C-alpha cells in the first residue's frame, strides 16, 4: 500500500534533481563554450589590427 | 491577602490553560512527527477529528481537479 507513495515522493525528488542538474551543467558549459568562442574573434580582430598597423607604418 | 489570592488564582489559571493547551499541541506533534517520519514537490502535515475525514478528502479531490495525495 503505502510503500507505492513513499517511493514516488523520492523517485519525484530524484527526477527533478536530475534533469536540473544536467541543465545546470549544460548552461555553464555553454558560457564557457561562449567565452572560447568570443576569444578566437578577438585574436582575430588583434591580428586584423597588428597587419593594419604594419601597413601603416 | 484577598489581591494575593485573587491574582494567584487569575495568573496561575491563565498559565494552567496556556500550558495545558500547549501540552496538548505538542502531543498531537509527537504523533504527527511520527506518521510524517514514514515519508520540487511540497506538502502540509496536521491531525483533525476522525469523523470529518470523509467531507475533508472528498473536498481536496474536488478543490483541486482530482489531484491531491493524502494519508
Known amino acids: ?57 | 491577602n484577598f489581591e494575593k489570592i485573587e491574582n494567584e488564582l487569575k495568573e496561575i489559571n491563565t498559565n494552567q490553560e496556556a500550558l495545558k493547551r500547549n501540552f496538548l499541541e505538542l502531543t498531537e506533534l509527537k504523533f504527527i512527527l511520527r506518521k510524517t517520519q514514514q515519508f520540487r514537490l511540497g506538502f502540509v502535515a496536521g491531525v483533525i477529528n476522525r469523523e470529518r475525514i470523509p467531507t475533508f478528502e472528498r473536498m481536496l479531490w474536488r478543490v483541486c481537479r482530482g489531484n491531491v495525495f493524502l494519508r
Open chain 1, 1 to 57: 500500500s503505502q510503500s507505492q507513495g513513499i517511493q514516488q515522493l523520492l523517485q519525484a525528488e530524484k527526477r527533478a534533481a536530475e534533469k536540473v542538474s544536467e541543465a545546470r551543467k549544460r548552461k555553464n558549459r555553454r558560457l564557457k563554450q561562449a567565452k572560447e568562442e568570443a576569444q578566437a574573434e578577438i585574436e582575430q580582430y588583434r591580428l586584423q589590427r597588428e597587419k593594419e598597423f604594419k601597413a601603416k607604418e
